[PDB]
Amino acid sequence: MLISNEWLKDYVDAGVKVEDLAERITRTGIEVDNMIDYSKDIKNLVVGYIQSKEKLNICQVDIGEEEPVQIVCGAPNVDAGQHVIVAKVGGRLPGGIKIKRAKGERSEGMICSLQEIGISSNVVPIFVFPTEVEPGTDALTALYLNDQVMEFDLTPNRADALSMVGTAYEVAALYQTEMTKPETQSNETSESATNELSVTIDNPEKVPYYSARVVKNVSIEPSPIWVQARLIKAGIRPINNVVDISNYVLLEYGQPLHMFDQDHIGSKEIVVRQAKDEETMTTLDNNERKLVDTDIVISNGQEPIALAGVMGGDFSEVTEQTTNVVIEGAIFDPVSIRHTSRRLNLRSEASSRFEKGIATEFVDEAVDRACYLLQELASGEVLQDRVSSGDLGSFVTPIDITAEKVNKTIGFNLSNDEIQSIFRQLGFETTLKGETLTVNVPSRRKDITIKEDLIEEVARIYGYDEIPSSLPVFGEVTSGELTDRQHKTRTLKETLEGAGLNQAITYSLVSKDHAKDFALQERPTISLLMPMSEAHATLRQSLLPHLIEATAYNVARKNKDVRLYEIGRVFFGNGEGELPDEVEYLSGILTGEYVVNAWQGKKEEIDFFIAKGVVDRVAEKLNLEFSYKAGKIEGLHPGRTAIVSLGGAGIGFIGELHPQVAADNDLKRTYVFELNYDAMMQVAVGYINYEQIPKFPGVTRDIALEVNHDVPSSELKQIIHNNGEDILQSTLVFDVYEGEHLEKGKKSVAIRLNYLDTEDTLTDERVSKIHDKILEALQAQGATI
């Protein structure tokens, strides 16, 4: 919302520089996020008067000095008798540019266009003064552009400030001086618009107010320069005295007004009702519009003659050959207006105002402003009365509040008389009754409805600098602690990090064809309705796609050693209109060297087993046990992928990337793991189980088992445990041999068997007894010693 300094002092004078006024406004609630200086770059610019004009054109401008100056000018429409805008020798301008005695003939100073002086696009309507202004007069002064405009970024609760008068009430408060509203009283013809005009709402649920006055006999034309500049300042190209007088009083009161030509309305009756099924009409757009149940129209008595709120009709509007006018001032349900405008891409500065809600206080007065104006500036003549439908109601809503309550919310220490002064300087009538103030809030502040709102007004004005500083004292005493899950997650992240893995943080949203990568179940994916970006369109069902990308990215930057982990959520769809299942995952990815010290010949490449070693360090730290079984996961190496299980359930996988995926991403051998961290965190582990150190030594036997090349070592270890009765403690593969010294398709797996009795020392013979049983079980399952 753009607010001209010059213009505002019609209603209030802050007796202060526009910077000072922006500052104080910003420091009390409404942010002035910029200040436009229309006088932008401007030095020595005066009215002048072309006395005579030769032949671009040699002009003799009286610029209010003892002698005329001679100015050469080849601008399109220029002659003598014109009062013009002259930037003298030694002056300055926008665009660039600064102007001196030039010569050819002899040229002293510069006569001006508008734009030249610095207007804009889409908002402009050499420059000639419609009025005979004194040569030598400061020119911007005369042009009402000796001015700076404040641009506000206003919030929904400050609609009041969408107006010059509402903003004037605000500023009158801030400087606790006075504001004045502008002339509304016209001189009225004997007759009344009651005799002219009929108004009914068939849809009063959606239209609280509609009303109309009539002003007869009007002189379409241009508006004075003030009306004109102001409109340009306020962002709107000044069109003609009657398009202006509407848009201007919009800016002034925030009450939108419609202008109908009486004689081209098409009756002496107006009807506000809903549009119907598919209902046809063509709007002063000349673009034809078929409607819906849920649009408000205006009609004459069987003619959709205006899309209420949004637009007008073709035919009933004001053309320049109009000479009588009905002026609308209505209230249209904020959301009906919102959805029409919205859909037909038809946002006006006047629908936008119906969106925010209207000052009830102001409807009739705003109407009366545009009628007086039409009087004053379209020589128009003003009928008595209005034809209003539907009741506006009270213009004061009273709210009680107490000082205690105010001090109790903020924690300062204000008296009733301090508090009372604030409301009275906001222009609210207040009455004290014991300890309670009754605050008559005007309809012009529709964002003040409750005592808390009134608290905010006091807070903001008296100032937040003032609020002392305290800390809340909680009478339910409770020790703040990480939960168990939270604490485990921090410790786990310390463990990963301690093993060299950097914490990644990736985007949740991937591309739609990536969203199911590495997923376990077929589960539906969640896509956005309107992605900003094809690459961020659907919620990932896996952490890996973006971790792989981050690895590719790093590697292309010649960061060859990448170790990253992430704990992060993935998303599976719960059919339609339910929240998805959000599941927390731990994942990571690894490539390059794990250990390097070149000068000592140390170079340990990351392989599957070091990736395994990371997933095991996780399990170890959390006091879990995982198991591992070959799995086939699309996108992983078929030969180097394991499924990780906890309590016999699959919780994840670890695998080298498929050679084709790695090649696509220009990576070397790269390892990822993904684990359902929710599954992991559901396991209650309790306290650590302490067992005293065994009193007696154990016995180790090694065995070398020839077995078909595809038997997993887990299988042999299980057979051994199955037969190990009470003393078999653990088993360790320490060598696998496949080569020429052994039947092709066989491997030899060497396993160290560790035996232990916590209650006794082991006789060779007790060990041999079980060891022999284990050998036989193995031998019978195809495992030759």
Partner: protein, 98 residues
């Protein structure tokens, strides 16, 4: 772009009890600015509006770079915006069951 990501991180707080005041907010926001920017940090509370809170403010920390009179971090302002805060709005309390 350099200053906008479509996915970012936030930390909110909510404290609701019987005599909570805006001075209690202030004291807490102050511990926050100290925690983040140093024991000598002051804060500044500027009027503002959010729909869920009322009164509302935006909160600056004093600049931890330049000690006073301005630098490029605080944009020769001395104050850096870092928080928004406010007293929760009744409608929010009442809708929650309070």
């Amino acid at each position: 772009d350099a200053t906008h990501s479509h996915q970012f991180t936030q930390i909110e707080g909510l404290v609701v009890d019987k005599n909570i005041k805006m001075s209690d907010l202030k004291g807490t926001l102050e511990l926050v600015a100290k925690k983040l920017f140093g024991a000598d940090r002051e804060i500044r509370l500027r009027p503002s509006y959010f729909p869920f809170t009322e009164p509302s403010v935006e909160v600056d920390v004093s600049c931890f770079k330049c000690k006073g009179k301005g630098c490029n971090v605080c944009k020769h302002t001395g104050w850096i915006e870092i928080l928004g805060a406010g007293m929760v709005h009744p409608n929010v309390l009442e809708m929650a069951g309070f």
